[model samples]
Target chain A: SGFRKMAFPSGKVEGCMVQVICGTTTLNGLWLDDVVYCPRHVICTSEDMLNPNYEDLLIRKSNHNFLVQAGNVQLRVIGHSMQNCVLKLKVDTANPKTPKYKFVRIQPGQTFSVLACYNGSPSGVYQCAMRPNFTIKGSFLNGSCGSVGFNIDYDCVSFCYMHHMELPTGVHAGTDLEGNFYGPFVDRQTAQAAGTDTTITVNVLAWLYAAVINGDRWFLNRFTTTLNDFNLVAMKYNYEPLTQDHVDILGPLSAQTGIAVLDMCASLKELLQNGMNGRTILGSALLEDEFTPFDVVRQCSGV
Target chain B: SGFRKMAFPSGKVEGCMVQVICGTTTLNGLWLDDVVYCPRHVICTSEDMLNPNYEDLLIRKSNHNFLVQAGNVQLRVIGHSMQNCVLKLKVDTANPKTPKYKFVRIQPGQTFSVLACYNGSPSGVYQCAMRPNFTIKGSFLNGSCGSVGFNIDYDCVSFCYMHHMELPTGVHAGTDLEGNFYGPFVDRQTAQAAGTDTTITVNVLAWLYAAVINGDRWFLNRFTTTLNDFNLVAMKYNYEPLTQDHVDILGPLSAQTGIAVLDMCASLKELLQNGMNGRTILGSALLEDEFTPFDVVRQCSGV
Candidate 1:
């Protein structure tokens, strides 16, 4: 009857630091950023949760006088069960010779903490070890809790949140008559954590107010010329089509990123005053052509 | 030339009487509610200008007198060469054999008054005859004009104006969820007259915040149900489908009809709320189900 010659850092440990003992050798130094149970165990929580409730091992920032930041560090457990759960902490530095840490029996709903140790050594990779309970129904299964690793150089930080604008309006013909270069407006962010290469694009089209009236058609043709000039200016600003959705899709993405379309013909009344001239016509055409597809004018021309 | 002879009655001709004559036959006659026009040409004056404008014409009634109201009308004549043109007003009483009216040339930009003559007869249809350039060259054509039509029968008067509506705000899911049933409201006639459907179909999907996780497919399915329900109710009420630009067409038609269509999950949320009890849910479901395709909660819940 083995009373159990268990490891020092039991299945769950508390505090900023823990001693990892292998056989009779005492590995008095190791750290953990966070510990989470297997996926199936956390039912209510989203798989994307960066911080699980179980445990968090703090890392001391040397630059901040070894102060533990309030944010939690994330760790990935790569196995089916918690039997041989391996935990890794991304630290700035650590000893390479005795890198692995171990844990023993883990009870449900328990929380533990480990320290983020930095020996000031050049940043390198690190790993950890774990074992399942012999008495527990799900015991030490092969590859049950796969290896977990961390980078010892970089510190994880909160990502920057992005804000977006409201959808545009007033799409109409004679707006973008010459095919205005619109948008490069930001629609959304990528799924990758802290993704850097976010893409944006704009939609370009010819808007027609009334297809029946030859007058409206003539207006659209004139408007198109104005739109061409706008496109020239827009292109000079380093705009490009980032994806199919931006260029072709005319929904939420268009509302957020594409120029508002307008009905130039519907807006003809505004352009047709007694005082209007050719230059005024051109300016009005350009404004209408550039913003009508996005419905921007309807909002802007709120009289 | 012939005498260009004309004649008139010495006294008032009562109900449905015929008096003024271009020849041996009466030139005009009037019945009970009818007024016939009788005119003699002497270089056509303010009293002789009939059908002054082609765009829109008006008819009104006061006391027992039927009058023709004139609107600002513009006429454009196009031809290689032109000559003399004559405008004629011919009233065909219910009795086509004894039609009444007069002939005169319309001077450019002149207003004319049409009076009711009594010869005693029922009201009748009035038609205009246009004779262009008896001596001019190249074919002559008239520009399109606006016209209004009304009928006077004994004691009642009815009229209809022709116009169009611009961007009409249709109903959608968000509005329904918000318990708003009044509009994506629009003054369509004004919008159309302004030469465009200023009305836009706003896709409220972005506002559909409660989509089910791994339930987009389900949401789509339930969304169809809700949409169909709206369509059915609208159809029942004789609501017409309002069309918008292609962008508006991409999503639900909620914005066009002022009817909101909610996905099943969102509907479920609303239904599950304490305030939205069984009766309300049932009523909405039934109303919606008539036009939409979806099972009621009773069916889904096995109630």
Candidate 2:
């Protein structure tokens, strides 16, 4: 993200405090309405990451900029930005031209806690991005180029904290494998903690928000994650808990591809029951994972 | 074709009555593990394509290399190749270099025909790639980047024959919408020849081979193929056959986004049913409209 602002020039900003804005201007540009930060999130554009040039506006922090502090919560712009912008903290909203505030560079997809503070003038109540920003709320961004845990704003460029090579190689990326674009991950601890089933169902993760149809989200981790290219849609043809009539599909794929495509789970019942969310578009994300590797050129975007 | 036998540069090098060799040695340069002429199948290396110094071996109208005549079947090499490497037309004894003839690029996805023939030595009846290359046996590359028809062979660089800007941009490509990779088409003619269904499963034609999972495979043909990248996995939610009852279970993805991912078709219904008798990977060529903009690139590859 090229757009960001900080409380202290050197410290890490926590969340979007005041008004988080997104525009459809240009790469690192701005927009008029609450147009999505990333159109549909399936794809982000240069304009999606670029905040407008709010600099030319007056330097008065008089949105009553002062008295509105969220406690020791110093503010800063965060989450996916490609432009150099700032949130104004006013010591002297009165000082007019030379007002008082600090600007920090949040290069998107960054974690919060790591603050690097810098000195600036009368830094009091500031009104930066005010969205309930949590270090991802423990929710990994779902789908390709999705994960953005920690405070590193959203960046289409950087990938999962535990990023790896493009699966099945780029060739097989958009194929049914789904390895091309989606970067599914798990809490190393949570993943391991799930215990073992014949293949266990303990730490079952989610592909969307919490958990719906567990494909890349949290179906069979050890099973599928083992291979870089393997993805959720393909998992339908290859996972276990997904078994019907007692036939184990996951094993054969692992045997055939040599890369375990799903994790082991003991509770096949629990795993499959996770499907109770009722079907919707999120399930469709699983399909995109296997069909379009967004990292490279998107086939859809092609002729 | 970087490979040239030069007809004994002097005389005729008959067909395969005796033996045909492919040194495990260098091909322009590389190891011989039956690896792809193209790794990603996106681009083939000069080495993979070259088969350096096939010229090293002497060429003669001997080794019975002479008596081998498939009539005037003088075969050169075809499909994708940086050099020449034709298939044998006859069965063989238990020889090493010349097992039995069978050479199909089967890059898991490719097109057909366009046999660049060279009049030469004792041209023989070779069963090389003789499984019958239907320019894709009617089977387009199975996934995105799949599908190929006509003598022109497969090449991703060649998008739609005429090609256009991305549809719905990139979002439509990977969805059940099938826009991500497969751009299923029907021989508007053959399609018409096949007759129409309540809709037209007749002309519904596949994204890959025969109609199994009706995703992009044999859905709305003229409708989808007109564009490219539409496929089956996505049809689970988007297509008419999928049904509103099957609201996509895929994601928080765009509403206009489409599809749930999978359906009652079951992975088995899809896989086991996917095989409709392999008459060669390609389904006997559909030289229809709306497939591989295989134009510019084909032009680039054409002699």
Candidate 3:
């Protein structure tokens, strides 16, 4: 019953990260508004973590006062639910004409977050203005010039963060009567039963090419050259009508181990069908324009 | 006279980035010691910037003292040759196990640098313990834990930076008499003149597949399907002599644009030769082990 879910990665951004979860597996994807940009894709085994690549590298931390100057930064402020206090923020532009942030105050009963950057600030530095008194010991705060409670995150270099998905590979998707999308089953019959139109073969090669462009290793390793070879074998078999049964019924044993024409063709079909279903869901998502896709080139301001 | 040059990015890392420059162009590459990882390649126009994707996004900044927390960071200390002072540094780990730095000092007579990470420190803060700081105003330090003279750069989030290179597309490379590598020229004659043996096509398909694997847009867009198509065309050409001129001399006009038999064969030869040269130089660099290749999966540690 699970369907595709999409959201932004962490901080403020203009794209949606789409994911469909089923038990232990998930397919994360980023569809761009531009047709030319290859949709980003990632397959993950865990749900809570948005990125599988950085999971093992996670260095954990909790509530703490944070600071940042240049590059991309994200800050979160926390306060007691019942007690209210004013949190003041400041930004000095180094220019005498127009500088300072005093009117910028936040009510401290709830949590607030800010995503900002002074990008390319030659001599810029950002500081928080609050009392030295806080609820924690062993804190870096010594005298004044500190914040009540906050956390920070930032990236100091240029980023080309293409929006991507975390999803299951070797599987594709489909929709139901209620028009609810679901899927990524591995085979054709199950995929068809699950509500996908499993017969469409147009654009199958292009879809496969897109998978190649996305650098899906499994797809590249398995089906990249096999299809063309299978096409040649089909020409040799003189199989007037190439049906799943007609191609696979011959089996590997009769075709000889040297070249299992029938068995190979069957394997190729399965691979193609699997990718085709995944492409179907992605194609529909793009057509509906449910959310703006992520841009490939995220400038240094905020990535 | 052209040969490969390898170096780390402006900051610090435990790896080497290699490149071979030519007139008006270059072939930047990263060859990791690990054979399992795919080598990273990027094609670029200008030679000065390390990155091509972020070129248009550059917002110039100079002489900046940076602040960072819970992420990767880099700092550069600069000073006049005639002047000298002790540049102090401090790190409050919020543990009080042991802290403060006065004995750890740098002579402000020259340029010094540091690459460090606080990495997951909750309330930890780093302060450059210097007084009054020099050079510029519009600076962020009011009365504070700022360094005397420095510039800062950092990345806040977890990173999976795969080391990559900027090189020419469709052109392979080779070495000459003095063991200096050169040439990515288009044709066999010029490539040989520049000293690359264009005969060995042992791993041609695998090399082609690697190009496809690297997701070279130009390679993917052009040769991905055409090679397989051309192979089919050659089967029909039935010409034992697969020489370049022999195949191309027939020309497309006579072969018929609808389905150019001889011309397609000729075009395929040129494409194969172009890629073969590129792989040659890359292969030798690994053998001599002149410089360590860049790793494909750079964990968040220092990526």
Residue-pair clashes, model 1? 71
- Give the number of the best model, judged by DockQ: 3
| TM-score of every prediction relative to native | 0.15, 0.18, 0.19
lDDT of 3 by residue, A110-205 (tens): 111111111111111111211111001111110111111122324211112111211222112221111122232221222122222222121222
Give lDDT: candidate 2, residue A227: 31
Tens-place lDDT per residue, model 3, B1-303, is 011111111111111122222223322211122111111111123353333332232222112321212223222212101001111112222211111211122211111111111111111111121111111111111111111112223421111111121122211222111112222321122212222222212122222222222332132222223434555543443312233432343233223323233333343454443432322332221111111111111110112
Worst 10 residues of 2 chain A by lDDT: A1-10
**Candidate 1 lDDT score at position B82:** 8
Give the Cα error of residue A298 in candidate 1, in Å.
Answer: 25
Which of the numbered candidates is closest to the native, going by highest lDDT?
A: 3
Off by over 4 Å in 3: A1-66, A71-204, A207-303, B1-297, B300-302
Q: RMSD for each model, in Å, please?
A: 35.5, 28.2, 25.4
Provide the overall lDDT of each model, using Cα atoms, as 2-decimal numbers: 0.20, 0.20, 0.22
By the lDDT metric, which is better: model 2 or model 3? 3
- What would the per-residue lDDT of candidate 1 be over residues A1-303, giving only the tens digit for each residue? 000001111111112223322122222122343422111112112231334332322121112212222113322222111121122323343322232333332221111111111211111111111101101011111111111112111122111110111122111000010111112322122222211211111312322221111122233323322334433434443323223332333343225423233323222323332212323221122222211222221111110
lDDT of 1 by residue, B94-165 (tens): 322222332223311111111112222211111111111111000111100011112222223222110011
Greater-DockQ candidate between 2 and 3: 3
